[PDB]
Design an enzyme around this catalytic site. Sequence first.
Site, short mmCIF file in Angstrom:
data_model
loop_
_atom_site.label_atom_id
_atom_site.label_comp_id
_atom_site.label_asym_id
_atom_site.label_seq_id
_atom_site.Cartn_x
_atom_site.Cartn_y
_atom_site.Cartn_z
N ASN A 6 -91.97 -46.26 44.44
CA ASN A 6 -92.42 -44.93 44.92
C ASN A 6 -93.21 -45.00 46.24
O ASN A 6 -93.81 -44.00 46.64
CB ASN A 6 -93.27 -44.21 43.86
CG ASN A 6 -92.66 -44.25 42.48
OD1 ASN A 6 -93.28 -44.74 41.52
ND2 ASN A 6 -91.42 -43.76 42.36
N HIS A 23 -95.97 -46.59 46.87
CA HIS A 23 -97.41 -46.68 46.68
C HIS A 23 -97.78 -48.17 46.58
O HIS A 23 -96.97 -48.97 46.11
CB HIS A 23 -97.83 -45.94 45.39
CG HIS A 23 -97.77 -44.45 45.52
ND1 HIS A 23 -98.82 -43.72 46.04
CD2 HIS A 23 -96.73 -43.60 45.29
CE1 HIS A 23 -98.41 -42.46 46.08
NE2 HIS A 23 -97.16 -42.34 45.64
N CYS A 75 -105.16 -47.18 48.17
CA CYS A 75 -105.03 -47.62 49.55
C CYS A 75 -103.67 -47.12 50.02
O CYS A 75 -102.65 -47.34 49.36
CB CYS A 75 -105.14 -49.14 49.66
SG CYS A 75 -104.68 -49.83 51.28
#
Lengths: 264, 265
Positions: free
Chosen positions: B186, B188, B223
């Site tokens: 995804n 991330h 982050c």
Amino acid sequence: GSLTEDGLSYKEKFVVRSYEVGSNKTATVETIANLLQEVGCNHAQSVGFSATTTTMRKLHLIWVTARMHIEIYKYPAWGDVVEIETWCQSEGRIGTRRDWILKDSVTGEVTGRATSKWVMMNQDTRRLQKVSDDVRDEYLVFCPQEPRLAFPEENNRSLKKIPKLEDPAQYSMIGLKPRRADLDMNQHVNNVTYIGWVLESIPQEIVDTHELQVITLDYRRECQQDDVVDSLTTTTSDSQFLHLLRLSGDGQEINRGTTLWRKK
Amino acid sequence: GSLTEDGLSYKEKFVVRSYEVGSNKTATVETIANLLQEVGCNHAQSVGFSATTTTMRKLHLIWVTARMHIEIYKYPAWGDVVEIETWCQSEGRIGTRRDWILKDSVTGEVTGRATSKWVMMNQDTRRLQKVSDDVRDEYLVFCPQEPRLAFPEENNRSLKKIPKLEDPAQYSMIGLKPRRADLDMNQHVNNVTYIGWVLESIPQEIVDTHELQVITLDYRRECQQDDVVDSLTTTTSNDSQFLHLLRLSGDGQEINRGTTLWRKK
Ligand SMILES: NC(=O)CCn1cnc2ccccc21
Ligand SMILES: NC(=O)CCn1cnc2ccccc21
């Protein structure tokens, strides 16, 4: 995994993991490169190299990669089983070659292929050496005698000369540093980390709309654990790119390569 | 891998790979953490999830990790087979918990254990919310009803409060950036990357003479792919303990806090 019936090649199956896939839900090229190195290591173990011989160890000699060439037709999906066959061949005194064939386990179809050139180097002085008869003889009983190439075609992409990228680069990613996860059991930067660093300077737009079909990478010098790298890319064109990895300060070349990408 | 006979937990075996090991020829803590997440993902798939229910997908709700706690007694060697069992349990409206037990396949001995706390969050607004009955009911048929804890002890390390590291830090590793291999499907940053970043500020001398026995990590903020991180460590202690802080390089915004316990080799 296991050696094949004739004992001259090695096969292994892998189920693609959730953390091994990219935004397309298929294995990244770094996951494929890690599996190629895992199957190479298991082949060396299976034939008694627990990949140096006793003669190489007495002379502080090791095999190091000079060139890696990978071509992927279809990346395996998350949960898919991929089968990889690997073998080695002597290239006279120049060094050795390790080849691989990747197949979809369910269909038996060839989904990828790779070839790599290895040279003999003294581990302490880092000086390259030609292959002697004593060493060649110790490995030849583990290699097919008739030529067997993953890239047999005449004038193929695996044997093309790579030029040096000229400044200014079209794209760049600077300040790349290895962390402990990028190091192998001997505390040297893993060869696959350099593939990742090369790919870091490809724009996100190309990654989002294209698939990586071919990557050829030359290894000139190693990156130390406390070194910093700059990744440089220029479009040369399907989209083709020329790549350069160099140390952040002095600009010392560590790698050069080319990639070919297909529209999705 | 497969669900166990009662269908309330999942087991899987892994053969440790050549690139998965450190200098001692044994699995790194990041390799173990990747295997824990792989077995968790296979458990969710085996019971019809993908790990949101249809109700959660309608409301744009996801499960996110708030805390991870891992204790390793023996790291598996290169070529060893490790067996991991995982299960989930509801913690009322606070969220859910996923637990793991790691065993040596040959001896049957427990070589590690882990526990993690997950909370419900809206994917878009990033706002946390308590677990509603409609959602709770949908996953309770996949959890043991009697409590089953990987860390059952009364004053165990998995539930301890973590303080904020005060400047100046004793050690630091600055300018840490994620690359494409650090991102999940995804896009991330993978949770395991934060464990690696925490460990980057531990001196090489400690890594060369000690083995990591326990790591507790709190996840405060994510982050981004274009963010830069600073990793900070201070010794707090035959055993060495450290306090850790990950924060954004510029504004100093906290992303994680944690503690590690190391034993002499
Ligand atoms: N390229 C290499 O893996 C060098 C070592 N090597 C050469 N011939 C081999 C045959 C089997 C296993 C390792 C071998
Ligand atoms: N802790 C989590 O993995 C959240 C999702 N989840 C909640 N209960 C579960 C039961 C099985 C698989 C995933 C489950």
